[PDB]
Design a protein around this ligand. Structure first.
Ligand SMILES: Nc1ncnc2c1ncn2[C@@H]1O[C@H](COP(=O)(O)OP(=O)(O)NP(=O)(O)O)[C@@H](O)[C@H]1O
Length: 816
């Protein structure tokens, strides 16, 4: 309700660029939140609508120097495929190689002298005093490769400098330009005084630098493209066309037309042939078949589909042809919001994420400053204290004096110090790891929306389990009926009929369960009238039913918890109070019966706990996370059900009205808490809950409060989600550690600090190391793809042998 927009940005190539984007867009008034993702080439901003419109924000973006636009809905193919830039990097790298090959050849020639040289290594035979032929060929290669290849980098530095920010390639432009100019001036002085010996100059480095930098950019963009495999597949999995037909009377054949997605609308009939795709989600009309959700929910067993079931737009048909009534078309499709969630996931930046953005923003300036300081220190120490340098540079060469070799060494060190920095590595260390973690999670059915839960799941120390829909399957079934009051005027069939018709309006899962049970065990699907209906959350229901004779041919009812009776002046006798205690002791919820103030009997309505709950909870508490069950049912029922799962503390008689006070009660101590809710049923609790994962929200991942979604109703998804977040955040930390230690070792090592020992790297080695690090970080992130979703037996394999027992006595409940 604040006009937030998802914006598409082009030209993003450096992390410092996006840092500039956030910095200034926050600098501009009227913007409260501004985040940009470099990897996905997109930007999302929340802005005040009336004062400023999207035109103004976009225009701010172009005056930055980048081309933006409102993100489209379907078309997002060429933005994420990365094909174009990897192809032009192929082009540039090959254009650099066709000149590096001569550099390779001359380097190998000049390094190793032959055993029996033909003419005593005449390759360096000078022609013009001070200008060796080798130096001249170096000059021509360097000049031509500069002019042609470095055009791209020069233009990038030019456009970057047109504004305040300096991107990554600018420092490479400085490296090459400084090498060029200093080599040129040394050559000019050599040819001016007509020096006998041509000097050694940095014409070797520009083409080697270009070859290795192009190779590194190619490799790292290829790896980045491999990062988006999951999102790319999900995006290019939706069918762009569908078979729409017309039905005469009995779903017969009238006519068929082939239609694209933009034209089809809701309610249309779509035919999918065997082996076909599902282009639109909808309701199954007729035709038994099977479907597979491997690419969507990451499940294994091919899900069966029958007339009246649901479908997913993207599953492959297996048997026969089936007709579907369109219910969600285009953006409505489940895959649409799945991919939307995945792509926005890399928009909610983590604390470490924004720290990395900050550092990378002020990194290239830091690198250039450090390079200049290194140059200054080397030149001054040479010009003043020559004893230290001569301690390891004693070679007396009348051809080249110490005053010149020292300056040359200083320039080499300053070139290699900024040629070894990898701003790209630091910038893309975290975002790519986040992208790969989210992709693997989605491939397993886990939709970890937002990047915040990735790290915020690291610090979780308590998990709040809901009872209905999470611990239980959510399909309660009626066990047995108890009769307490009169029988003559209250025959069993009549009382069940009247109660069922009364609670027909109810939408509580147990209410619908009892409706179906009564209808099936009476055979009378019809029901009477209802008047004066109310539903107090967490207490019960009650209403007035008329037309009782409708089913009797074959009445103010009160149904709810004990609090409803005591509040309504309905005494609960000890005999009945103890009557249901037997049920509650077996972890099965029970509901009493009261009509016109007469407690006729009681009804036992319960659902078996998920068999996997015990293993999942034992693993979760062994992993080092507290577990607590939240429920609104009777305290005895919570006590019994916790036994089947072994929960130390629970919160029973927690009516949905508050349903959150206990969240704060657990939060106030500061320990992080996560809840595993249902979604729409208790969305506010998840919203307040720090890490609220929705369980079983298949085909309805459109949940706002929950920051994590499990497309499949499998409790083990929760433990898998926490464990996957653990490893993904560990990988983010590892990537940051690598991208840092690389820089803090390269800058000294490239600064020649350890040269006295005898380890000094000549310039192009710096570019090689830059490429190596910038690709190694991405490979480390890609390693996350090698994740195997642990299966049932796997968890108890490590948990087997220690299922710590506990009786109801050693179990806690809510206080007050
Ligand atoms: N349809 C109903 N008829 C009679 N009583 C009901 C009905 N629905 C709820 N109640 C009463 O209100 C209480 C609320 O139950 P409920 O809050 O759904 O427990 P839960 O297992 O924690 N499910 P949830 O609210 O999703 O966490 C029930 O225990 C009953 O005592």
């Amino acid at each position: 309700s604040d006009g937030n927009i998802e914006l598409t940005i082009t030209g993003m190539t450096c992390a410092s660029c996006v840092h500039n984007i956030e910095s200034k867009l926050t600098r501009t008034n009227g913007i409260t939140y501004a985040s940009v993702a470099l990897a996905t080439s997109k930007a999302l901003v929340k802005f005040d609508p009336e004062i400023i419109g999207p035109r103004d924000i976009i225009k701010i973006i172009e005056e930055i120097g980048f081309h933006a636009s409102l993100a489209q809905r379907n078309p997002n193919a060429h933005h994420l495929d990365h094909k174009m830039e990897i192809k032009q990097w192929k082009k540039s790298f090959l254009c650099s190689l066709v000149f590096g090959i001569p550099v390779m050849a001359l380097m190998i020639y000049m390094l190793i002298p032959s055993n029996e040289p033909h003419q005593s290594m005449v390759l360096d035979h000078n022609i013009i005093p001070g200008l060796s032929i080798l130096n001249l060929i170096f000059f021509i290669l360097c000049t031509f490769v500069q002019l042609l290849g470095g055009w791209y980098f020069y233009v990038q530095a030019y456009k970057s400098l047109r504004h305040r920010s300096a991107n990554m390639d600018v420092l490479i432009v400085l490296a090459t330009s400084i090498a060029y100019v200093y080599s040129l001036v040394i050559l000019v002085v050599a040819v001016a005084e007509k020096a006998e010996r041509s000097p050694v100059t940095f014409f070797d480095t520009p083409p080697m630098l270009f070859v290795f930098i192009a190779l590194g950019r190619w490799l790292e963009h290829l790896a980045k493209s491999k990062t988006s495999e999951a999102l790319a597949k999900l995006m290019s999995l939706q069918a762009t066309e569908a078979t729409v037909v017309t039905l005469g009377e009995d779903n017969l054949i009238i006519r068929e037309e082939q239609v694209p997605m933009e034209l089809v609308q809701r309610g249309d009939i779509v035919k999918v042939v065997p082996g076909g795709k599902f282009p639109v989600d909808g309701k199954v009309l007729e035709g038994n078949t099977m479907a597979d959700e491997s690419l969507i929910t990451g499940e294994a067993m091919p899900v069966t589909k029958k007339p009246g079931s649901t479908v997913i737009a993207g599953s492959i048909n297996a048997h026969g042809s089936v007709l579907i009534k369109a219910t969600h078309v285009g953006n409505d499709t489940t895959l649409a919001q799945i991919v939307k969630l995945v792509e926005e996931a890399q928009m909610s930046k983590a604390p470490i994420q924004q720290l990395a953005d900050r550092f990378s923003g002020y990194f290239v300036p830091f690198i250039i400053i450090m390079s200049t300081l290194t140059l200054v220190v080397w030149i001054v120490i040479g010009f003043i204290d020559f004893g230290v340098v001569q301690r390891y540079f004693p070679n007396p060469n009348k051809h080249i004096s110490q005053t010149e070799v020292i300056i040359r060494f200083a320039f080499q060190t300053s070139i290699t110090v900024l040629c070894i920095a990898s701003p790209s590595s630091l910038g893309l260390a975290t975002p790519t790891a986040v992208m790969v973690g989210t992709g693997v999670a989605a491939q397993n059915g886990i939709l970890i929306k937002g990047g915040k839960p990735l790290e915020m799941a690291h610090k979780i120390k308590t998990v709040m389990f809901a009872k209905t829909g999470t611990i239980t399957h959510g399909v309660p079934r009626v066990m047995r009926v108890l009769l307490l009051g009169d029988v003559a005027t209250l025959p069993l069939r009549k009382v069940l009929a009247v109660v069922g018709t009364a609670e027909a309006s109810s939408e509580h899962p147990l209410g619908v369960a009892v409706t179906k049970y009564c209808k099936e065990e009476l055979g009378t699907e019809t029901l009477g009238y209802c008047t004066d209906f109310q539903a107090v959350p967490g207490c019960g229901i009650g209403c007035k039913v008329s037309n009782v004779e409708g089913i009797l041919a074959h009445f103010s009812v009160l149904i709810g918890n004990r609090e409803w009776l005591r509040r309504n002046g309905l005494t609960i006798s000890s005999d009945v109070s103890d009557a249901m205690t037997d049920h509650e002791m077996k972890g099965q919820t029970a509901i009493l019966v009261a009509i016109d103030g007469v407690l006729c009997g009681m009804i036992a309505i319960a659902d078996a706990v998920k068999q996997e709950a015990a293993l999942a909870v034992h693993t979760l508490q062994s992993m080092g996370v507290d577990v607590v069950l939240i429920t609104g049912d009777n305290r005895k029922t919570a006590r019994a059900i916790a036994t089947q799962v072994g929960i130390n503390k629970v919160f029973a008689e927690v009516l949905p009205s508050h349903k959150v006070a206990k969240v704060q009660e657990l939060q106030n101590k500061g320990k992080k808490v996560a809840m595993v809710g249902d979604g729409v049923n208790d969305s506010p609790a998840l919203a307040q809950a720090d890490m609220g994962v929705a369980i079983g929200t298949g085909t309805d991942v459109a949940i706002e409060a929950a920051d994590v979604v499990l497309i499949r109703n499998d409790l083990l998804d929760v433990v898998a989600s926490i464990h996957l977040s653990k490893r993904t955040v560990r990988r983010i930390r590892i990537n940051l550690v690598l991208a840092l230690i690389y820089n803090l070792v390269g800058i000294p090592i490239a600064a020649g600090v350890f040269m006295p020992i005898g380890i000094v790297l000549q310039p192009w080695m710096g570019s090689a190391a830059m490429a190596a690090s910038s690709v190694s970080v991405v490979l480390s992130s890609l390693q996350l793809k090698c994740y195997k979703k642990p299966d049932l037996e796997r968890y108890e394999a490590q948990a087997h042998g220690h299922m710590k027992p506990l009786t109801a006595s050693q179990v806690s409940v809510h206080i007050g």
